């Protein structure tokens, strides 16, 4: 089997053979497409052998040592551990490779041209929440790099029996707090209200402001999670101003420089790393469109249009669209002026097309999620809009997992 | 088709439960392992084989549709339904095809629209004027029917949705075709240097027209002649009477210089290259029209790189930092252009809907359909507008895609498959 994808802007046609090696479901059936479903729907000894074999096979294939003496001994050694301990431990090389390929396989990530420049911090020796904090701070400092951002991941001990999971309860390492007011309004980031309430309950004393960096909520070895404040000198932040509108800085807007997803699960050879925060740098629209302009988020469109003296009486004036662009200009200009790494959605999508072409050539394809790859603004004027994409699930993979507070059974009475 | 599939709106948390998908009939192109939701044409799964079907091939599809239609009018198993089956059975027994009742044709056309998972406009789906052109025998007659469609649908700017349905496919050698992709489109000319004048999408069709003897005025907005094929014969050129072609000169409510770009668009989007499939019958010529979502013109027609590509020209006039992309100069000009398109259509009282109104309407339609029908097939990739997607409600709306019949289908451009006489 082969599959063609076509770019309708360039008429380039790529041939995906890589899809033959996927194994878990898309969620789609032969007769329904679930391409727009956000989330469609611990291993025994016997479940774990084939998964581990598959991963050791492809690692050794990647490094041109398939069938080698070292490949067969590694395969045998993995089976022993799974026989002995019902699990096994990745070598450091495998762990680095697994983590880079999970990023490589992230069909929803437009920034994968960078996938092989990933700093892997092996934190599998970690045993307590303080340890996770230290590991995470070092991650933050290294990744932030005074604004010259570097992609990195810190991998904490894999799942064992599901009762001793490591988790970062934060969804990102740096996020702003959300407080719902009695009058119904929200101060700060409405997306983080629930998690803010959990922190407050765990003892966090909130500054109750608009951009309070949340504390880390860290869970080691299935124990109750524990609060830590990131040292403020490690939280690099960019105050948002506009190159044309002097009044823009008076919105008091800022964002953090470091996007650092911490709520996902890293799966490598059947091993599950429930705590694996990873970071890169922002595409402008993540902040300028979603964080700032989703009605469920900071919802600054009416404020910005107001200060632009836009006619907001009818939608067809396109005051929202107009305000959105300026906000996104400001975000990009702000970051670039403070020499904090950021990519505009045009640059980001252009590189992804180049990445996707290269991936088809050397790897035989590139699973890609159009719903996610296409930026949330100016969709068709980016090249990815016109690029057909095949979506399929390769492993190593980043996986969603339940929020820890829906599953954690609390220890201390 | 599992057991009952929920879709959630992540802006409102509204969850809708889908059972309609059980009635899905042909493959989406996806599998458990690979999703083709961004493939323009993912499947080749037809209800019936390409050529003159046998009885056991056509009748089951006919039985399905007639069953569906009589069910729709609460007459399942009734006298008329059981006669209709026997009638279709004899008809197929004798002519290898069958003819639709007017009611059935109208039902079928509206449900093809209703089932068009890619159409954001389907809240209107039952307000569709159906012109029966199944008595048409020549390209001239096709021109007459089309002009009447255009005039009725245009309605002096108060646009009305319409479909005109020419005789169905019989053996495949006697197809009626509108060779135009839309009834009204602008020519595209390849320039001596290498660039393109007019609309690059239509260069090939423009060439067939010139090659067929059309005298190109060779402008940027030359309304293409109709190229109509009746009963498999060679297609014939007809000039649509310009008084029937409503056009809007694009100006801006603030940029008085915008009028001087010399841009205009036509008022009536009228898809004419698609196939309407009903109970196994195949209407290869079925021009349908409604009215524009502004972004179709302002974003795609005007701003695609392989279309009119007016961005840099408009950006220049705006005095925009065009050195680097991070200035978002494209994004900024894009918004101004779409303000202009909407402002111009509305100033001339020509029906148009912005992408905010349209998407909000479609959310409402989805809700209605889950209420009454138990589901609504929707192609998120096509529904979400090509600009400002996430500030429209449909970006945050999960959608299930599945293929219901009756339906509109793509079909090969006739010049790939037509043997001239
Ligand atoms: C280097 C710069 C990077 C850029 C510019 C980038 C860009 C993006 C963007 C725009 C998204 C969509 C986010 C959203 O709209 O919510 C995304 C998703 C994602 N990225 Fe990247 N990314 C980068 C680095 C990374 C790294 C280093 C990893 C992992 C090692 C990664 C893994 C993922 C995953 C798993 C998703 C899906 C997240 C989800 O499903 O919620 N990315 N990326
Ligand atoms: C009445 C106002 C209507 C509006 C505002 C509307 C809106 C749209 C838009 C924006 C698209 C996507 C076009 C593109 O990006 O290429 C579309 C596609 C489509 N519409 Fe509608 N539409 C309308 C009427 C109709 C009617 C009357 C029919 C059929 C009787 C119809 C059937 C379809 C179909 C089949 C598609 C898919 C076209 C394709 O796959 O190439 N629409 N519609
Ligand atoms: C490494 C990286 C770089 C970048 N620019 N974006 C992302 C992302 C994302 C998606 N994000 C949605 C919100 C969340 F659930 F909190 C975490 C997941 C990740
Ligand atoms: C009835 C109607 C209303 C509306 N507003 N848009 C459409 C459309 C379309 C899709 N279009 C793509 C380009 C084409 F192939 F040339 C013709 C078909 C249809
Ligand atoms: C309903 C839809 O699946 C949902 O809104 C998706 C759309 N595409 C997205 N794309 C990105 N990059 N991030 C998102 O959160 C979403 N949300
Ligand atoms: C590759 C991709 O499917 C293609 O560019 C699609 C994307 N979504 C679209 N959506 C609409 N409404 N119209 C289109 O032509 C397209 N093109
Ligand atoms: Zn799919």
Tab-separated table of N, CA, C and O in Angstrom, chain A residues 3 8-9 19 22-23 25-26 28-33 36-39 289-290 295-296 301 315-318 320-322 325-326 328-329 332 336 344-346 370-371 376-381 385-386 388-392, chain B residues 1 10-11 21 24-28 30-36 38-40 299-300 304-305 325-328 330-332 335-336 338-339 342 346 354-356 380-381 386-391 395-396 398-402:
chain	number	residue	atom	x	y	z
A	3	UNK	N	0.023	5.780	-0.103
A	3	UNK	CA	-1.005	6.816	-0.078
A	3	UNK	C	-0.398	8.131	-0.524
A	3	UNK	O	0.670	8.511	-0.044
A	8	UNK	N	-2.458	21.488	-2.757
A	8	UNK	CA	-3.276	22.093	-3.802
A	8	UNK	C	-2.806	23.486	-4.188
A	8	UNK	O	-3.315	24.050	-5.162
A	9	UNK	N	-1.851	24.046	-3.454
A	9	UNK	CA	-1.243	25.314	-3.814
A	9	UNK	C	-0.048	25.120	-4.743
A	9	UNK	O	0.147	25.908	-5.674
A	19	UNK	N	2.679	5.190	7.149
A	19	UNK	CA	1.421	4.897	7.822
A	19	UNK	C	1.225	3.412	8.054
A	19	UNK	O	0.500	3.034	8.978
A	22	UNK	N	1.754	2.270	11.758
A	22	UNK	CA	1.008	2.754	12.911
A	22	UNK	C	0.251	1.600	13.559
A	22	UNK	O	0.065	0.542	12.953
A	23	UNK	N	-0.171	1.792	14.818
A	23	UNK	CA	-0.879	0.680	15.456
A	23	UNK	C	-2.062	1.041	16.345
A	23	UNK	O	-3.036	0.279	16.372
A	25	UNK	N	-5.454	3.337	17.374
A	25	UNK	CA	-6.506	3.877	16.529
A	25	UNK	C	-6.390	5.390	16.369
A	25	UNK	O	-5.852	6.093	17.227
A	26	UNK	N	-6.906	5.894	15.241
A	26	UNK	CA	-7.158	7.322	15.130
A	26	UNK	C	-8.410	7.725	15.878
A	26	UNK	O	-8.562	8.895	16.224
A	28	UNK	N	-11.159	7.268	14.182
A	28	UNK	CA	-12.011	7.166	13.004
A	28	UNK	C	-12.299	5.712	12.684
A	28	UNK	O	-11.498	4.823	12.969
A	29	UNK	N	-13.445	5.480	12.063
A	29	UNK	CA	-13.809	4.188	11.519
A	29	UNK	C	-13.824	4.277	9.996
A	29	UNK	O	-13.631	5.346	9.401
A	30	UNK	N	-14.078	3.130	9.364
A	30	UNK	CA	-14.202	3.090	7.918
A	30	UNK	C	-15.299	4.018	7.415
A	30	UNK	O	-15.244	4.446	6.258
A	31	UNK	N	-16.281	4.357	8.264
A	31	UNK	CA	-17.440	5.132	7.844
A	31	UNK	C	-17.655	6.427	8.615
A	31	UNK	O	-18.535	7.200	8.237
A	32	UNK	N	-16.904	6.699	9.679
A	32	UNK	CA	-16.984	7.998	10.336
A	32	UNK	C	-15.580	8.556	10.441
A	32	UNK	O	-14.624	7.808	10.663
A	33	UNK	N	-15.451	9.860	10.230
A	33	UNK	CA	-14.213	10.575	10.470
A	33	UNK	C	-14.372	11.355	11.764
A	33	UNK	O	-15.366	12.070	11.944
A	36	UNK	N	-11.932	15.881	13.969
A	36	UNK	CA	-12.061	17.099	14.762
A	36	UNK	C	-12.329	16.819	16.230
A	36	UNK	O	-12.424	17.768	17.013
A	37	UNK	N	-12.419	15.552	16.623
A	37	UNK	CA	-12.602	15.196	18.026
A	37	UNK	C	-11.297	15.435	18.782
A	37	UNK	O	-10.242	14.885	18.422
A	38	UNK	N	-11.367	16.259	19.830
A	38	UNK	CA	-10.172	16.593	20.607
A	38	UNK	C	-9.538	15.345	21.217
A	38	UNK	O	-8.352	15.064	20.998
A	39	UNK	N	-10.320	14.572	21.974
A	39	UNK	CA	-9.861	13.340	22.620
A	39	UNK	C	-10.763	12.190	22.184
A	39	UNK	O	-11.836	11.979	22.768
A	289	UNK	N	-3.774	34.655	19.639
A	289	UNK	CA	-5.085	34.215	19.198
A	289	UNK	C	-5.810	33.433	20.282
A	289	UNK	O	-6.917	33.790	20.685
A	290	UNK	N	-5.182	32.380	20.800
A	290	UNK	CA	-5.885	31.505	21.732
A	290	UNK	C	-5.859	32.043	23.163
A	290	UNK	O	-6.915	32.306	23.754
A	295	UNK	N	-12.815	33.229	23.753
A	295	UNK	CA	-13.817	33.768	24.669
A	295	UNK	C	-13.676	33.152	26.055
A	295	UNK	O	-13.912	33.831	27.054
A	296	UNK	N	-13.262	31.883	26.126
A	296	UNK	CA	-12.987	31.172	27.371
A	296	UNK	C	-11.638	31.523	27.993
A	296	UNK	O	-11.322	30.984	29.060
A	301	UNK	N	-10.483	40.868	23.114
A	301	UNK	CA	-10.904	41.434	21.839
A	301	UNK	C	-11.704	42.718	22.024
A	301	UNK	O	-11.410	43.733	21.382
A	315	UNK	N	-20.952	42.363	13.328
A	315	UNK	CA	-19.814	41.469	13.116
A	315	UNK	C	-19.142	41.745	11.777
A	315	UNK	O	-17.910	41.672	11.662
A	316	UNK	N	-19.937	42.076	10.752
A	316	UNK	CA	-19.423	42.231	9.396
A	316	UNK	C	-18.480	43.418	9.244
A	316	UNK	O	-17.840	43.542	8.196
A	317	UNK	N	-18.367	44.290	10.246
A	317	UNK	CA	-17.250	45.227	10.230
A	317	UNK	C	-15.910	44.515	10.399
A	317	UNK	O	-14.871	45.104	10.088
A	318	UNK	N	-15.925	43.263	10.873
A	318	UNK	CA	-14.719	42.458	11.129
A	318	UNK	C	-13.818	43.102	12.179
A	318	UNK	O	-12.586	43.047	12.096
A	320	UNK	N	-13.410	42.083	15.224
A	320	UNK	CA	-12.672	41.010	15.885
A	320	UNK	C	-11.434	40.620	15.090
A	320	UNK	O	-10.322	40.560	15.638
A	321	UNK	N	-11.615	40.324	13.801
A	321	UNK	CA	-10.482	39.976	12.944
A	321	UNK	C	-9.405	41.059	13.012
A	321	UNK	O	-8.216	40.767	13.183
A	322	UNK	N	-9.822	42.326	12.911
A	322	UNK	CA	-8.882	43.440	12.913
A	322	UNK	C	-8.115	43.511	14.225
A	322	UNK	O	-6.885	43.626	14.233
A	325	UNK	N	-5.423	40.692	14.614
A	325	UNK	CA	-4.147	40.865	13.922
A	325	UNK	C	-3.226	41.764	14.739
A	325	UNK	O	-2.059	41.434	14.983
A	326	UNK	N	-3.748	42.902	15.196
A	326	UNK	CA	-2.928	43.839	15.954
A	326	UNK	C	-2.385	43.191	17.223
A	326	UNK	O	-1.214	43.359	17.559
A	328	UNK	N	-1.799	40.093	17.652
A	328	UNK	CA	-0.782	39.134	17.263
A	328	UNK	C	0.480	39.820	16.781
A	328	UNK	O	1.581	39.283	16.968
A	329	UNK	N	0.340	40.996	16.163
A	329	UNK	CA	1.507	41.806	15.834
A	329	UNK	C	2.259	42.150	17.105
A	329	UNK	O	3.478	41.954	17.202
A	332	UNK	N	4.237	39.231	18.684
A	332	UNK	CA	5.481	38.974	17.963
A	332	UNK	C	6.491	40.085	18.194
A	332	UNK	O	7.645	39.822	18.530
A	336	UNK	N	10.160	39.683	20.041
A	336	UNK	CA	11.352	39.948	19.241
A	336	UNK	C	12.154	41.117	19.801
A	336	UNK	O	13.388	41.102	19.756
A	344	UNK	N	6.508	33.327	14.090
A	344	UNK	CA	5.200	33.692	13.603
A	344	UNK	C	4.616	32.507	12.844
A	344	UNK	O	5.333	31.604	12.406
A	345	UNK	N	3.294	32.511	12.710
A	345	UNK	CA	2.623	31.359	12.128
A	345	UNK	C	2.959	31.190	10.649
A	345	UNK	O	2.920	30.072	10.137
A	346	UNK	N	3.325	32.260	9.956
A	346	UNK	CA	3.762	32.096	8.573
A	346	UNK	C	5.083	31.350	8.518
A	346	UNK	O	5.197	30.296	7.878
A	370	UNK	N	-4.179	18.122	10.551
A	370	UNK	CA	-4.545	19.373	9.908
A	370	UNK	C	-5.326	20.285	10.848
A	370	UNK	O	-5.108	21.499	10.882
A	371	UNK	N	-6.280	19.720	11.588
A	371	UNK	CA	-7.115	20.520	12.471
A	371	UNK	C	-6.245	21.323	13.422
A	371	UNK	O	-6.526	22.495	13.716
A	376	UNK	N	-4.672	29.039	14.145
A	376	UNK	CA	-6.041	29.473	14.460
A	376	UNK	C	-6.439	30.817	13.848
A	376	UNK	O	-7.520	31.317	14.146
A	377	UNK	N	-5.583	31.455	13.054
A	377	UNK	CA	-5.943	32.669	12.348
A	377	UNK	C	-5.304	32.598	10.978
A	377	UNK	O	-4.332	31.861	10.773
A	378	UNK	N	-5.881	33.343	10.027
A	378	UNK	CA	-5.274	33.500	8.706
A	378	UNK	C	-4.975	32.149	8.071
A	378	UNK	O	-3.970	31.977	7.379
A	379	UNK	N	-5.835	31.172	8.337
A	379	UNK	CA	-5.609	29.798	7.934
A	379	UNK	C	-5.118	29.577	6.514
A	379	UNK	O	-4.014	29.056	6.336
A	380	UNK	N	-5.884	30.020	5.497
A	380	UNK	CA	-5.539	29.691	4.121
A	380	UNK	C	-4.363	30.489	3.583
A	380	UNK	O	-3.808	30.107	2.548
A	381	UNK	N	-3.980	31.603	4.214
A	381	UNK	CA	-2.786	32.292	3.740
A	381	UNK	C	-1.519	31.694	4.316
A	381	UNK	O	-0.422	32.183	4.010
A	385	UNK	N	-2.454	25.096	5.189
A	385	UNK	CA	-3.865	25.012	4.871
A	385	UNK	C	-4.081	24.185	3.609
A	385	UNK	O	-4.962	23.315	3.561
A	386	UNK	N	-3.232	24.391	2.606
A	386	UNK	CA	-3.379	23.794	1.287
A	386	UNK	C	-2.684	22.458	1.159
A	386	UNK	O	-2.672	21.872	0.063
A	388	UNK	N	-2.581	18.685	1.996
A	388	UNK	CA	-3.195	17.474	2.508
A	388	UNK	C	-2.219	16.754	3.425
A	388	UNK	O	-1.014	16.742	3.177
A	389	UNK	N	-2.759	16.131	4.467
A	389	UNK	CA	-1.980	15.492	5.523
A	389	UNK	C	-2.648	14.193	5.934
A	389	UNK	O	-3.875	14.112	6.006
A	390	UNK	N	-1.844	13.176	6.201
A	390	UNK	CA	-2.354	11.921	6.728
A	390	UNK	C	-2.115	11.880	8.224
A	390	UNK	O	-1.004	12.169	8.690
A	391	UNK	N	-3.152	11.521	8.972
A	391	UNK	CA	-3.055	11.439	10.419
A	391	UNK	C	-3.087	9.975	10.823
A	391	UNK	O	-3.964	9.221	10.392
A	392	UNK	N	-2.098	9.576	11.614
A	392	UNK	CA	-1.990	8.229	12.141
A	392	UNK	C	-1.054	8.302	13.334
A	392	UNK	O	-0.310	9.268	13.504
B	1	UNK	N	-19.666	2.669	12.314
B	1	UNK	CA	-20.843	3.091	13.068
B	1	UNK	C	-20.948	2.349	14.403
B	1	UNK	O	-21.667	1.352	14.493
B	10	UNK	N	-16.005	22.932	22.861
B	10	UNK	CA	-15.072	23.271	23.930
B	10	UNK	C	-15.177	24.717	24.370
B	10	UNK	O	-14.496	25.115	25.323
B	11	UNK	N	-16.010	25.504	23.708
B	11	UNK	CA	-16.293	26.858	24.147
B	11	UNK	C	-17.497	26.894	25.081
B	11	UNK	O	-17.489	27.628	26.074
B	21	UNK	N	-25.221	8.860	12.189
B	21	UNK	CA	-24.105	8.240	11.487
B	21	UNK	C	-24.330	6.754	11.240
B	21	UNK	O	-23.658	6.179	10.380
B	24	UNK	N	-24.918	6.065	7.704
B	24	UNK	CA	-23.846	6.347	6.760
B	24	UNK	C	-23.711	5.194	5.776
B	24	UNK	O	-23.843	4.024	6.143
B	25	UNK	N	-23.439	5.519	4.524
B	25	UNK	CA	-23.533	4.515	3.477
B	25	UNK	C	-22.217	4.202	2.780
B	25	UNK	O	-21.982	3.038	2.449
B	26	UNK	N	-21.341	5.180	2.573
B	26	UNK	CA	-20.094	4.930	1.863
B	26	UNK	C	-18.904	5.496	2.640
B	26	UNK	O	-19.043	6.373	3.497
B	27	UNK	N	-17.725	4.955	2.323
B	27	UNK	CA	-16.533	5.136	3.144
B	27	UNK	C	-16.077	6.588	3.161
B	27	UNK	O	-16.120	7.288	2.146
B	28	UNK	N	-15.636	7.041	4.329
B	28	UNK	CA	-15.036	8.363	4.412
B	28	UNK	C	-13.613	8.382	3.898
B	28	UNK	O	-13.082	9.464	3.643
B	30	UNK	N	-11.289	7.061	5.876
B	30	UNK	CA	-10.525	6.830	7.090
B	30	UNK	C	-10.601	5.365	7.492
B	30	UNK	O	-11.448	4.602	7.018
B	31	UNK	N	-9.688	4.976	8.380
B	31	UNK	CA	-9.733	3.690	9.042
B	31	UNK	C	-9.408	3.900	10.513
B	31	UNK	O	-9.072	5.003	10.951
B	32	UNK	N	-9.502	2.819	11.280
B	32	UNK	CA	-9.080	2.864	12.667
B	32	UNK	C	-7.669	3.421	12.784
B	32	UNK	O	-7.381	4.167	13.719
B	33	UNK	N	-6.806	3.146	11.799
B	33	UNK	CA	-5.392	3.493	11.884
B	33	UNK	C	-4.990	4.766	11.145
B	33	UNK	O	-3.908	5.302	11.414
B	34	UNK	N	-5.796	5.273	10.225
B	34	UNK	CA	-5.348	6.433	9.475
B	34	UNK	C	-6.542	7.308	9.132
B	34	UNK	O	-7.529	6.837	8.562
B	35	UNK	N	-6.442	8.585	9.485
B	35	UNK	CA	-7.497	9.554	9.261
B	35	UNK	C	-7.155	10.382	8.033
B	35	UNK	O	-6.043	10.919	7.926
B	36	UNK	N	-8.108	10.472	7.109
B	36	UNK	CA	-7.939	11.229	5.878
B	36	UNK	C	-8.781	12.495	5.862
B	36	UNK	O	-9.054	13.047	4.788
B	38	UNK	N	-8.219	15.445	6.026
B	38	UNK	CA	-7.730	16.592	5.270
B	38	UNK	C	-7.441	16.248	3.808
B	38	UNK	O	-6.795	17.030	3.106
B	39	UNK	N	-7.916	15.098	3.335
B	39	UNK	CA	-7.793	14.729	1.931
B	39	UNK	C	-8.970	15.321	1.168
B	39	UNK	O	-10.130	15.162	1.574
B	40	UNK	N	-8.673	16.027	0.076
B	40	UNK	CA	-9.730	16.683	-0.687
B	40	UNK	C	-10.719	15.662	-1.238
B	40	UNK	O	-11.936	15.860	-1.157
B	299	UNK	N	-10.778	35.969	1.107
B	299	UNK	CA	-9.658	35.170	1.579
B	299	UNK	C	-9.128	34.253	0.485
B	299	UNK	O	-7.942	34.286	0.165
B	300	UNK	N	-10.001	33.435	-0.110
B	300	UNK	CA	-9.557	32.387	-1.020
B	300	UNK	C	-9.412	32.891	-2.455
B	300	UNK	O	-8.344	32.769	-3.059
B	304	UNK	N	-5.523	33.625	-2.084
B	304	UNK	CA	-4.714	32.439	-2.361
B	304	UNK	C	-3.558	32.817	-3.283
B	304	UNK	O	-3.683	33.694	-4.146
B	305	UNK	N	-2.418	32.145	-3.101
B	305	UNK	CA	-1.266	32.432	-3.951
B	305	UNK	C	-1.531	32.042	-5.403
B	305	UNK	O	-1.150	32.775	-6.325
B	325	UNK	N	7.837	38.272	7.645
B	325	UNK	CA	6.468	37.824	7.876
B	325	UNK	C	5.948	38.249	9.243
B	325	UNK	O	4.746	38.481	9.388
B	326	UNK	N	6.823	38.371	10.251
B	326	UNK	CA	6.336	38.638	11.599
B	326	UNK	C	5.600	39.971	11.719
B	326	UNK	O	4.893	40.178	12.711
B	327	UNK	N	5.714	40.872	10.736
B	327	UNK	CA	4.881	42.066	10.776
B	327	UNK	C	3.401	41.752	10.583
B	327	UNK	O	2.568	42.618	10.845
B	328	UNK	N	3.065	40.530	10.175
B	328	UNK	CA	1.691	40.119	9.919
B	328	UNK	C	1.028	41.014	8.875
B	328	UNK	O	-0.181	41.267	8.924
B	330	UNK	N	0.513	40.327	5.721
B	330	UNK	CA	-0.507	39.539	5.034
B	330	UNK	C	-1.792	39.491	5.848
B	330	UNK	O	-2.875	39.784	5.333
B	331	UNK	N	-1.680	39.154	7.138
B	331	UNK	CA	-2.858	39.059	7.994
B	331	UNK	C	-3.637	40.364	8.018
B	331	UNK	O	-4.877	40.364	8.004
B	332	UNK	N	-2.924	41.484	8.033
B	332	UNK	CA	-3.567	42.781	8.155
B	332	UNK	C	-4.286	43.153	6.865
B	332	UNK	O	-5.451	43.562	6.890
B	335	UNK	N	-7.505	41.094	6.398
B	335	UNK	CA	-8.683	41.621	7.083
B	335	UNK	C	-9.278	42.803	6.316
B	335	UNK	O	-10.497	42.882	6.117
B	336	UNK	N	-8.433	43.752	5.902
B	336	UNK	CA	-8.949	44.906	5.177
B	336	UNK	C	-9.679	44.476	3.915
B	336	UNK	O	-10.751	45.003	3.602
B	338	UNK	N	-11.254	41.750	3.337
B	338	UNK	CA	-12.532	41.110	3.610
B	338	UNK	C	-13.562	42.088	4.153
B	338	UNK	O	-14.755	41.943	3.861
B	339	UNK	N	-13.123	43.082	4.929
B	339	UNK	CA	-13.982	44.218	5.243
B	339	UNK	C	-14.526	44.820	3.956
B	339	UNK	O	-15.728	45.093	3.834
B	342	UNK	N	-17.203	42.557	2.121
B	342	UNK	CA	-18.472	42.613	2.844
B	342	UNK	C	-19.123	43.981	2.709
B	342	UNK	O	-20.321	44.087	2.423
B	346	UNK	N	-22.746	44.534	0.769
B	346	UNK	CA	-23.859	45.062	1.551
B	346	UNK	C	-24.287	46.441	1.074
B	346	UNK	O	-25.477	46.778	1.143
B	354	UNK	N	-21.065	37.275	6.457
B	354	UNK	CA	-19.700	37.202	6.964
B	354	UNK	C	-19.464	35.845	7.627
B	354	UNK	O	-20.388	35.056	7.853
B	355	UNK	N	-18.199	35.567	7.942
B	355	UNK	CA	-17.884	34.267	8.509
B	355	UNK	C	-18.287	34.154	9.977
B	355	UNK	O	-18.472	33.033	10.460
B	356	UNK	N	-18.464	35.273	10.686
B	356	UNK	CA	-19.002	35.203	12.047
B	356	UNK	C	-20.472	34.798	12.032
B	356	UNK	O	-20.879	33.862	12.726
B	380	UNK	N	-15.041	19.448	9.561
B	380	UNK	CA	-14.461	20.585	10.276
B	380	UNK	C	-13.441	21.315	9.404
B	380	UNK	O	-13.362	22.550	9.421
B	381	UNK	N	-12.678	20.564	8.606
B	381	UNK	CA	-11.633	21.159	7.774
B	381	UNK	C	-12.218	22.189	6.807
B	381	UNK	O	-11.574	23.202	6.499
B	386	UNK	N	-11.499	30.222	6.421
B	386	UNK	CA	-10.065	30.318	6.134
B	386	UNK	C	-9.374	31.517	6.770
B	386	UNK	O	-8.163	31.683	6.574
B	387	UNK	N	-10.070	32.360	7.532
B	387	UNK	CA	-9.382	33.322	8.382
B	387	UNK	C	-10.056	33.383	9.747
B	387	UNK	O	-11.256	33.108	9.885
B	388	UNK	N	-9.260	33.745	10.762
B	388	UNK	CA	-9.772	33.992	12.112
B	388	UNK	C	-10.536	32.784	12.644
B	388	UNK	O	-11.551	32.913	13.335
B	389	UNK	N	-10.062	31.594	12.283
B	389	UNK	CA	-10.835	30.394	12.556
B	389	UNK	C	-11.258	30.273	14.005
B	389	UNK	O	-12.434	30.057	14.307
B	390	UNK	N	-10.309	30.448	14.930
B	390	UNK	CA	-10.627	30.181	16.323
B	390	UNK	C	-11.504	31.261	16.948
B	390	UNK	O	-12.091	31.021	18.008
B	391	UNK	N	-11.623	32.440	16.347
B	391	UNK	CA	-12.613	33.362	16.896
B	391	UNK	C	-13.966	33.147	16.224
B	391	UNK	O	-14.861	33.985	16.351
B	395	UNK	N	-14.742	26.563	15.078
B	395	UNK	CA	-13.399	26.081	15.402
B	395	UNK	C	-13.410	25.246	16.671
B	395	UNK	O	-12.733	24.218	16.753
B	396	UNK	N	-14.184	25.670	17.664
B	396	UNK	CA	-14.268	25.013	18.955
B	396	UNK	C	-15.314	23.916	19.000
B	396	UNK	O	-15.537	23.339	20.072
B	398	UNK	N	-16.477	20.251	17.974
B	398	UNK	CA	-16.221	18.950	17.381
B	398	UNK	C	-17.329	18.600	16.400
B	398	UNK	O	-18.492	18.955	16.595
B	399	UNK	N	-16.956	17.888	15.343
B	399	UNK	CA	-17.905	17.474	14.324
B	399	UNK	C	-17.595	16.054	13.882
B	399	UNK	O	-16.430	15.651	13.823
B	400	UNK	N	-18.642	15.286	13.626
B	400	UNK	CA	-18.516	13.975	13.014
B	400	UNK	C	-18.754	14.118	11.527
B	400	UNK	O	-19.708	14.788	11.113
B	401	UNK	N	-17.885	13.505	10.731
B	401	UNK	CA	-18.060	13.447	9.287
B	401	UNK	C	-18.408	12.026	8.875
B	401	UNK	O	-17.763	11.062	9.326
B	402	UNK	N	-19.433	11.919	8.024
B	402	UNK	CA	-19.933	10.682	7.444
B	402	UNK	C	-20.725	11.037	6.184
B	402	UNK	O	-21.166	12.171	6.010
